[PDB]
Curated annotation (Swiss-Prot), chain A:
Main function: Component of the chloroplast ribosome (chloro-ribosome), a dedicated translation machinery responsible for the synthesis of chloroplast genome-encoded proteins, including proteins of the transcription and translation machinery and components of the photosynthetic apparatus.
Domain of life of the native organism: Eukaryota
Similarity comment text for this entry: Belongs to the bacterial ribosomal protein bL31 family. Type A subfamily.
Protein's name in the database: Large ribosomal subunit protein bL31c
Remarks, miscellaneous: Three forms, which differ in pI, are produced, L31 alpha, L31 beta and L31 gamma.
Compartments, record wording: Plastid, Chloroplast
Coverage span on the entire protein: 38 to 101 of 130
Subunit structure of this chain's protein: Component of the chloroplast large ribosomal subunit (LSU). Mature 70S chloroplast ribosomes of higher plants consist of a small (30S) and a large (50S) subunit. The 30S small subunit contains 1 molecule of ribosomal RNA (16S rRNA) and 24 different proteins. The 50S large subunit contains 3 rRNA molecules (23S, 5S and 4.5S rRNA) and 33 different proteins.
From Swiss-Prot, chain D:
Organism this protein belongs to: Spinacia oleracea (Spinach)
Chain's gene name: RPL5
Principal subcellular localization: plastid
Keyword Mitochondrion set for record: no
Signal sequence, renumbered to the chain: none
Protein known as: Large ribosomal subunit protein uL5c
Localization, UniProt: Plastid, Chloroplast
Keyword line: Chloroplast, Plastid, Ribonucleoprotein, Ribosomal protein, RNA-binding, rRNA-binding, Transit peptide
Assigned protein family: Belongs to the universal ribosomal protein uL5 family.
Organism lineage string: Eukaryota, Viridiplantae, Streptophyta, Embryophyta, Tracheophyta
One GO BP annotation of this record: translation
rRNA-binding is among the record's keywords: yes
From Swiss-Prot, chain E:
GO annotation, cellular component aspect: chloroplast; mitochondrial large ribosomal subunit
Function: Component of the chloroplast ribosome (chloro-ribosome), a dedicated translation machinery responsible for the synthesis of chloroplast genome-encoded proteins, including proteins of the transcription and translation machinery and components of the photosynthetic apparatus.
Disulfide bonds: none
The species this protein was found in: Spinacia oleracea
Protein name in UniProt: Large ribosomal subunit protein uL16c
Family: Belongs to the universal ribosomal protein uL16 family.
Keywords recorded for this protein, A-Z: Chloroplast, Methylation, Plastid, Ribonucleoprotein, Ribosomal protein
GO MF terms, alphabetically ordered: rRNA binding; structural constituent of ribosome
InterPro entries with a match to the protein in the record: Ribosomal_uL16, Ribosomal_uL16_bact-type, Ribosomal_uL16_CS, Ribosomal_uL16_dom, Ribosomal_uL16_sf
Pfam families, sorted: Ribosomal_L16
Subunit structure and binding partners: Component of the chloroplast large ribosomal subunit (LSU). Mature 70S chloroplast ribosomes of higher plants consist of a small (30S) and a large (50S) subunit. The 30S small subunit contains 1 molecule of ribosomal RNA (16S rRNA) and 24 different proteins. The 50S large subunit contains 3 rRNA molecules (23S, 5S and 4.5S rRNA) and 33 different proteins.
The gene coding this protein: rpl16
Plastid found in the keyword field: yes
Compartments where located: Plastid, Chloroplast
GO biological process: mitochondrial translation
Curated annotation (Swiss-Prot), chain F:
GO biological process: translation
Organism: Spinacia oleracea (Spinach)
GO MF annotation, one: structural constituent of ribosome
Protein name: Large ribosomal subunit protein bL33c
SUBUNIT field: Component of the chloroplast large ribosomal subunit (LSU). Mature 70S chloroplast ribosomes of higher plants consist of a small (30S) and a large (50S) subunit. The 30S small subunit contains 1 molecule of ribosomal RNA (16S rRNA) and 24 different proteins. The 50S large subunit contains 3 rRNA molecules (23S, 5S and 4.5S rRNA) and 33 different proteins.
Residues of the full protein shown: 9 to 59 of 66
Function comment: Component of the chloroplast ribosome (chloro-ribosome), a dedicated translation machinery responsible for the synthesis of chloroplast genome-encoded proteins, including proteins of the transcription and translation machinery and components of the photosynthetic apparatus.
Chief localisation class: plastid
RNA sequence: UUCUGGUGUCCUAGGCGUAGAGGAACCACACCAAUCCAUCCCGAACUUGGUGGUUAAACUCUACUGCGGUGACGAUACUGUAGGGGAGGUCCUGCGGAAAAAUAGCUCGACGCCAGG
RNA sequence: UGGCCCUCGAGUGCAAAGGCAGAAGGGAGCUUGACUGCAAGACCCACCCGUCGAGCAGGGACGAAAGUCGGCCUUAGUGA
C-alpha cells in the first residue's frame, strides 16, 4: 500500500569500526556497527570469563 | 485451510443462492492454471446445455508457454460461450462466479458473455 | 408463598402430514426453530414456518 | 543478502542429510511474527504512538494494535482493547529480519545462550521464539525507559526431530 | 448418603416397574444381597446395613454398597395441608426393583458372610436373599 | 430514554394529487438528529425525511 | 471406450488411518515481478503477467475392518384389547403389534451430462 | 502471538426450548424495505384476538447479475 509504509531502502551501508563494509537492505542508509557476529568474541569471551579467571592457590603463591 | 478447499467452499457458498432453472440455465467457470472451463448446465434435469473451454478456442489462439488463463482468452471464450448458446435457445441466463471473486478476468468473461445479447 | 403457576398455552406442530394434498399458501409445518428444513416447492416463513407454494403432496427425506 | 546463501548450499545438505527423494519436501522458513505485549496502551497514547513510529522502525512495516479476544476480570481489559501491538512480516523482509536477528541479536546480547536445545523443542509445526532486544540500534534507545515486550516467532514447514534446529544452525545462530 | 450438588431441588416420585435386568449382576465381591421386592430404601437403612455388616465382618474383607439414593422425598409439615413448599433437605431415597444387587462382600468365608449378609438384611423393608458369584 | 418521534418531509401545501404532509413513526433518537431516506411520499421519489 | 476433471443428484451417507501408483494429457504446489485489485501489516489470501520443475504437499484410483458409521435374526421388556391376583407397592394369563442395547454381519459409496487422447 | 489435537462442546442484547458450522456465529463496504396501496390461501380457532403468506403496482437499497429486502434466528417486551 502507498502513503503509510516507511521507506524500505535497498542500499543500506553497514560500516564496521574495523574498516569492513557490507551491504544490507533496511531503513537507514548508514549503520555504524559494533561487535557484529563475524569476528565477535563469543569464542574468546567464554574463554576469558568463566573458564580461566578462577584461582585461589596460584594467587596465594605469587605473594610469598 | 488450503486453497482448493477454500475455492470449493466458496463455490458451495455461491450454489445456495443461484440455481439452474429450466427457463434459465446456469453457466459455471473453472480457471485452472492451464485452461478455463465454462458450463451452461440445467440443474432441474441435471445435464449440460452448452460447454466450452480453453481446449475449444485453443485451436487458433493460445500460448501454452504463457500462463494459460489470461484476460484475452477470457474475452474469447466469453465470446464463443456467448455465441454458442445463442444458436440453441438460451437467451436469459443466470451467471455465477465459480468460487472466484469477481474482480479479475471473469469481468471480461461475464461482459463477453453479455456481448452477444444474453439477458444476464 | 409458592412461586409457580406460570403456564403458557402456546401451540405448534405438524399441520399437514406426509402423502397429503396441500394448497397454495397452506401452512405445512408450524415449528420452533427448524426441525423441518425447506426443501423444494415450499417456503420458509418469518418465524421459520414452512408453507407450500404449489398444489400436490408433501414428502420428507 | 542471505537468501542467495540460503538457496544453493544449505538446502541440498538438508536434502541429503535426511535422505529425501524429492526437492520440495525439504522444509523452509515460512513467516516470522513480532508482537509487543502491552497491557496499557489506551492510556499510554504516546506509547502506542511509540509502537507505531518506533516499532514501525524496529520492523519493516507498520505494526497493528491488536483488539482483545476476550475480557478478563481483574485486569483493565474490555472487548476490543489494545493488548499488544503486533506485525507479521514475510518475504524478503523475513530473511532481512532473521538476518537482523543474526546481526542485531546474536552478538549484542548480554547473555550468551543463543538457540537452545532445551527450548522451542517440540511442536506440531516447529516454532522458535525469543524475548530479547526491546530496542534495535537503529532507534535512539535512551528515550523509552520501559522494557516493553517483543517476541519474534519463526515458523517452519517441518514435522521432524532434527530439521528446524539444523535450519537455524546453518544460518548465523551459534550457541 | 446424600448427593453434594443437586441439579433440581425438589423432584416428584415415580412408580416401580419389573425386574431390573441391568443391575442384577455381580461386579465386585464374592457374595451379594439380591432384592426380590420393589420399593424404596433410604440412605438411613443403608447406614444401618452398612454398620451391621461391617461390624459383623469386623476382622477382614470389604463390603460394597451398590446403590445411591439420587432422589429426594419432600415431607410436608403439619401446617393444615395445601402446599408442597419445602421438604427437600429431608430424607433421600433409592429406588430398588427386583433382581437388583444391594450389597456385596468379599474376603469373608462361607457362614461368616451368611450371617454378615443375612443379619444386615433385617435392617431393610424388603425381602432379599444372598447370592454367590456364579 | 427511547423517545418516540415522527419523521417529516418538506411540507408543500399545494393542489396536486393529494399533496400533503407525510410524517412517519420512528424511535431510538437520543442522539444527533437523523434524517433517514424514508420515501414514497405524496411526491413519489423522496430523500432526507427530516426529524 | 476406459482413464482423466469440471459438474450435480440420490444416499445405507461412505470418513480417519495403514499400504501401492499417476505426471503423455489433465488437475494441483513451487520459483519472478507488480500496472486493475488487495490485505485494521505481510502478493500468507485475492488479482494480473511469465519462467515453466516436481510430486513433496493437495486431488484421483486399488486393497485392508485397526478405529468410525451402519446393523441383524431369534429372544425379551413394553403395549392395545379380554381377564385374573395382591392389603398396598404391583404382578400374571389368551390373541395382536413389537423393541432398545449388545452380538453375527454390512460399509473405504452408487447413478447421469458435457470437452480431450 | 505462533503450531498441533478434539469438530461444534463457543456464540446469538436477556430466561429457557427448538434452531443455526464455510452458518441464523465474527468482520468489512454501501446503506435505510424499521416503505406506500395491497393481497389468493392457510393455522389458531366461544367471541375478541393473534400468526404466516405466494403473488401485483409504484418508488427504491445492495449486488456485476441472479436475486433478496414490508425490521431483528424464532417464541415474551403489553391493553379492547
Amino acid at each position: 500500500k502507498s502513503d503509510i509504509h516507511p521507506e524500505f531502502r535497498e542500499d543500506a551501508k553497514v560500516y564496521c569500526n574495523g574498516e569492513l563494509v557490507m551491504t544490507t537492505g533496511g531503513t537507514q542508509k548508514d549503520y555504524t556497527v559494533e561487535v557484529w557476529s563475524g569476528n565477535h568474541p563469543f569464542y574468546l569471551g567464554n574463554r576469558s570469563a568463566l573458564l580461566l579467571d578462577a584461582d585461589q592457590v596460584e594467587k596465594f603463591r605469587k605473594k610469598y | 485451510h488450503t486453497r482448493r478447499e477454500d475455492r470449493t467452499a466458496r463455490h458451495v457458498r455461491i450454489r445456495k443462492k443461484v440455481e439452474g432453472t429450466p427457463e434459465r440455465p446456469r453457466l459455471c467457470v473453472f480457471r485452472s492454471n492451464k485452461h478455463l472451463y465454462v458450463q451452461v448446465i440445467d440443474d432441474t434435469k441435471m445435464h449440460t446445455l452448452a460447454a466450452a473451454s480453453t481446449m475449444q478456442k485453443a485451436i487458433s489462439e493460445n500460448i501454452d508457454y504463457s500462463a494459460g488463463p489470461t484476460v484475452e482468452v477470457a474475452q474469447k471464450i466469453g465470446e464463443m460461450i456467448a455465441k454458442s448458446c445463442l444458436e440453441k435457445g438460451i437467451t436469459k441466463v443466470a451467471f455465477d462466479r465459480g468460487g472466484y471473486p469477481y474482480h479479475g478476468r471473469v469481468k471480461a468473461l461475464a461482459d463477453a458473455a453479455r456481448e452477444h445479447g444474453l439477458v444476464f | 408463598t409458592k412461586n409457580g403457576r406460570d403456564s403458557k398455552g402456546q401451540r405448534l406442530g405438524v399441520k399437514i402430514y406426509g402423502d397429503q394434498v396441500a394448497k397454495p399458501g397452506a401452512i405445512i409445518i408450524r415449528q420452533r426453530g427448524t426441525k423441518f428444513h425447506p426443501g423444494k416447492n415450499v417456503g420458509i416463513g418469518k418465524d421459520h414456518t414452512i408453507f407450500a407454494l404449489i398444489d400436490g403432496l408433501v414428502k420428507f427425506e | 543478502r542471505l537468501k542467495t546463501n540460503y538457496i544453493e548450499k544449505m538446502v541440498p545438505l538438508l536434502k541429503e542429510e535426511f535422505s529425501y527423494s524429492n526437492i520440495l519436501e525439504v522444509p523452509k522458513v515460512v513467516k516470522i511474527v513480532v508482537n509487543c505485549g502491552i497491557g496499557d496502551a489506551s492510556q499510554n497514547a504516546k506509547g502506542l504512538d511509540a509502537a507505531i513510529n518506533e516499532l514501525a522502525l524496529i520492523t519493516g512495516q507498520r505494526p497493528v494494535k491488536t483488539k482483545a479476544k476476550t475480557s478478563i476480570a481483574g485486569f483493565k481489559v474490555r472487548e476490543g482493547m489494545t493488548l499488544g501491538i503486533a506485525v507479521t512480516l514475510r518475504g524478503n523482509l523475513m530473511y532481512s529480519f532473521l538476518d537482523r536477528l543474526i546481526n542485531l541479536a546474536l552478538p549484542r546480547t548480554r547473555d550468551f545462550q543463543g538457540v537452545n536445545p532445551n527450548s522451542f523443542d517440540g511442536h506440531g509445526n516447529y516454532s522458535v521464539g525469543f524475548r530479547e532486544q526491546s530496542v534495535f540500534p537503529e532507534i535512539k534507545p535512551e528515550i523509552v525507559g520501559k522494557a516493553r515486550g517483543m517476541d519474534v516467532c519463526i515458523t517452519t514447514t517441518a514435522k521432524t526431530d532434527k530439521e528446524a534446529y539444523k535450519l537455524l544452525s546453518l544460518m548465523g545462530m551459534p550457541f | 448418603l446424600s448427593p453434594k450438588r443437586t441439579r433440581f431441588r425438589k423432584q416428584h416420585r415415580g412408580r416401580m416397574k419389573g425386574i431390573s435386568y441391568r443391575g442384577n449382576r455381580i461386579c465386585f465381591g464374592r457374595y451379594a444381597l439380591q432384592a426380590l421386592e420393589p420399593a424404596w430404601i433410604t440412605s438411613r437403612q443403608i447406614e444401618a446395613g452398612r454398620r451391621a455388616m461391617t461390624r459383623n465382618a469386623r476382622r477382614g474383607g470389604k463390603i460394597w454398597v451398590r446403590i445411591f439414593p439420587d432422589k429426594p422425598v419432600t415431607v410436608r409439615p403439619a401446617e393444615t395441608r395445601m402446599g408442597s413448599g419445602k421438604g427437600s433437605p429431608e430424607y433421600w431415597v433409592a429406588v430398588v426393583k427386583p433382581g437388583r444387587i444391594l450389597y456385596e462382600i468379599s474376603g469373608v468365608a462361607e457362614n461368616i458372610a451368611r450371617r454378615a449378609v443375612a443379619i444386615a438384611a433385617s435392617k431393610m423393608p424388603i425381602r432379599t436373599q444372598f447370592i454367590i458369584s456364579g | 430514554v427511547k423517545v418516540i418521534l415522527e419523521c417529516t418531509g418538506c411540507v408543500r401545501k399545494s393542489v396536486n394529487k393529494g399533496s400533503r404532509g407525510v410524517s412517519r413513526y420512528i424511535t431510538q433518537k437520543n442522539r444527533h438528529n437523523t434524517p433517514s431516506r424514508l420515501e414514497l411520499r405524496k411526491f413519489c421519489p423522496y430523500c432526507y425525511k427530516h426529524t
